Design a protein around this ligand. Sequence first.
Ligand SMILES: Nc1ncnc2c1ncn2[C@@H]1O[C@H](COP(=O)(O)OP(=O)(O)O)[C@@H](O)[C@H]1O
Ligand SMILES: Nc1ncnc2c1ncn2[C@@H]1O[C@H](COP(=O)(O)OP(=O)(O)O)[C@@H](O)[C@H]1O
Ligand SMILES: Nc1ncnc2c1ncn2[C@@H]1O[C@H](COP(=O)(O)OS(=O)(=O)O)[C@@H](O)[C@H]1O
Lengths: 197, 195
Amino acid sequence: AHHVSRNKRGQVVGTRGGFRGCTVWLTGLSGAGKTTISFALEEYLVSHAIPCYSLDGDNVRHGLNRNLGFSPGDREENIRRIAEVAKLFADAGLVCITSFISPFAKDRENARKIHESAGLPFFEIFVDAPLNICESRDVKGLYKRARAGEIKGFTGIDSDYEKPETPERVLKTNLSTVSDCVHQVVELLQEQNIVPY
Amino acid sequence: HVSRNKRGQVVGTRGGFRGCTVWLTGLSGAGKTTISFALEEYLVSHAIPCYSLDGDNVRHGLNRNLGFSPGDREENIRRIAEVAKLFADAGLVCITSFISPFAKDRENARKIHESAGLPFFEIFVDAPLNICESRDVKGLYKRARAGEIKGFTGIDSDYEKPETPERVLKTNLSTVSDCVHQVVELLQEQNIVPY
Ligand SMILES: Nc1ncnc2c1ncn2[C@@H]1O[C@H](COP(=O)(O)OP(=O)(O)O)[C@@H](O)[C@H]1O
Ligand SMILES: Nc1ncnc2c1ncn2[C@@H]1O[C@H](COP(=O)(O)OP(=O)(O)O)[C@@H](O)[C@H]1O
Ligand SMILES: Nc1ncnc2c1ncn2[C@@H]1O[C@H](COP(=O)(O)OS(=O)(=O)O)[C@@H](O)[C@H]1O
């Protein structure tokens, strides 16, 4: 009695043969672009017949992580539960795109060494945009509420964002287009033999 | 994101959206993990992508910080039911193989799938505690009566028989292959497994 192999799994998940289970881990300041890259990437893989799944704020915040507030331990448990689920989707044969700020190198390496110890590729993607560009963009109003003292401890304002030193890609969203950053990430997945050339 | 409409075209080779949760529930040693294994081998044979949540990939991973106190079981299932919902939303057939004895935990698990629109199949693996105790596949029934395990379900914790499940499986009264086929017929009826 055993579970089905990743090789059999690699043959039934998509129309294109081979295991592709990996995890694409976006990280960056609120408003740097993680959501917009995630859909764009997700539309790409789907349009090219690669099943994927985004984990993001909307489908985690109020489900699996609904009992997790904004204390340091709670944001930590937040990235832990996301990481163990991303591993499961990866293990399932899918490409799992996570779009969480994840400000501390120390939770990101734990997520990475959760994947690497199951033999699953892990791609730290640094969505890099100057904080003042993020504060200008203010997509959800958060920076204005952080200045005002109504959001206490906000990444980039009152708690730090530890920038990836050694990530597989860096996306300079203040300098290039959405399509351009996606090309950087699709090309990564072609090198690592996830997306066929 | 990409709708379930378009995920049905890329996930699997069979065409159509199939995302759902087969949720096996019943006594420790009643055949949940056996059915989950054989059903998995069935769907992968028929080219239906799937994924199992069992004790192994959960106990020490996602739910590693959950004890065996009442709040912690509620949470155990709560987190499992959320992850099933994700794998179901993704276009996979998620199979869960936990005792999950309390009925409100199961009602909550179903609520989470239906409100999102995902099919939830409650599958009662049914075998008399005596046979399950007799089978004692892991040693737990032998430890439990001694008191090595306190609160074990069937001994010092109750088990709440699901009263309107989509299937009951007489693991003491029919073969693994018969019980798996009962689940296949339920999934063919609901346009999850092609004919
Ligand atoms: N190259 C780019 N990549 C991603 N987003 C960009 C880019 N250029 C401009 N933007 C804009 O930046 C904002 C990113 O917001 P969002 O994706 O919600 O950030 P986060 O990555 O924090 O979720 C969007 O308004 C998007 O239109
Ligand atoms: N119809 C059946 N379905 C599943 N298991 C069965 C059946 N009939 C007998 N068994 C036996 O019962 C035992 C079930 O144990 P297990 O699958 O570990 O159950 P659980 O996951 O509920 O603990 C196995 O040894 C299996 O061979
Ligand atoms: N350490 C943190 N400090 C402040 N806000 C956070 C932190 N972590 C996450 N957020 C906020 O989290 C929401 C995004 O979804 P979450 O699942 O809560 O976490 S997040 O990491 O992506 O940001 C947005 O409201 C996000 O901007």
